[PDB]
Amino acid sequence: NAMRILIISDVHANLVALEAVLSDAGRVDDIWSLGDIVGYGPRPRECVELVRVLAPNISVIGNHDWACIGRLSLDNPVARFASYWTTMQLQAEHLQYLESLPNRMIDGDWTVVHGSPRHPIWEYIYNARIAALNFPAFDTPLCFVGHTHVPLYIREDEALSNVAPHHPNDGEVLDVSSGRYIINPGAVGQPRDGDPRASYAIFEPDAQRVTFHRVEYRIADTQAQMREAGLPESLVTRLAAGV
Ligand SMILES: [Zn+2]
Numbered sequence: 001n002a003m004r005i006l007i008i009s010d011v012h013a014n015l016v017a018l019e020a021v022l023s024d025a026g027r028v029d030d031i032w033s034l035g036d037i038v039g040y041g042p043r044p045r046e047c048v049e050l051v052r053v054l055a056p057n058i059s060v061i062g063n064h065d066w067a068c069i070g071r072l073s074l075d076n077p078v079a080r081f082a083s084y085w086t087t088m089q090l091q092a093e094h095l096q097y098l099e100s101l102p103n104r105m106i107d108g109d110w111t112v113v114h115g116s117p118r119h120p121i122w123e124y125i126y127n128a129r130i131a132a133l134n135f136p137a138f139d140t141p142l143c144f145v146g147h148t149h150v151p152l153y154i155r156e157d158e159a160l161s162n163v164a165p166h167h168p169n170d171g172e173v174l175d176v177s178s179g180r181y182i183i184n185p186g187a188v189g190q191p192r193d194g195d196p197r198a199s200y201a202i203f204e205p206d207a208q209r210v211t212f213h214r215v216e217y218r219i220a221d222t223q224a225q226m227r228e229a230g231l232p233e234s235l236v237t238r239l240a241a242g243v
């Protein structure tokens, strides 16, 4: 009866971090993707292929996915960009899948977007001000968001009274029994909170509980794969620092 649901966001073509998360998560009944499957990392095809199969119910588009659907005809100094490189990795099947994705899913007690329910693809939620503007923008008890690459939770009354959002620790259990919440699982593939571990959440709707998790992964291996692809050193280094 009770389900256990893996919620992930911002994989960013980091296959090693995604595989580390999948093994870490354990027995799960469903997997939800909040977008940004590609961009930055060395394995965009493999990450799209995985997310496609694993997230049949909730898989929303991120801003990097939406950017990379862009076709370009390039007869050249532009070939230096990591954004351009990502686009060139995608084959028909990956493009078709990304093109199919909704920017918003509403099902039962939850709304899921990449950025914010006001601006699904684009808007970051990282303070009370913006959280407050977003609570009227969804009509379910819960809204799941990504895009900042930092795990986060805030209740509606806190946001409306300008109380700062919470940055959950590894293993932190959040009781979502009462009141409405905006919840961010952090990034699987490019965390930005100074903790280089991959980030995800586990949602158990029957228990009314969200648990936040971090998992170490082999950053050296993703870094090796990026250097092999000729990706810029500034992107390679960030991953060790979690910035
Ligand atoms: Zn992202």
Ligand SMILES: [Zn+2]
Pocket (backbone or CB within 6 Å): 010, 036, 062, 063, 064, 146, 147, 148
């Ligand atoms: Zn983003």
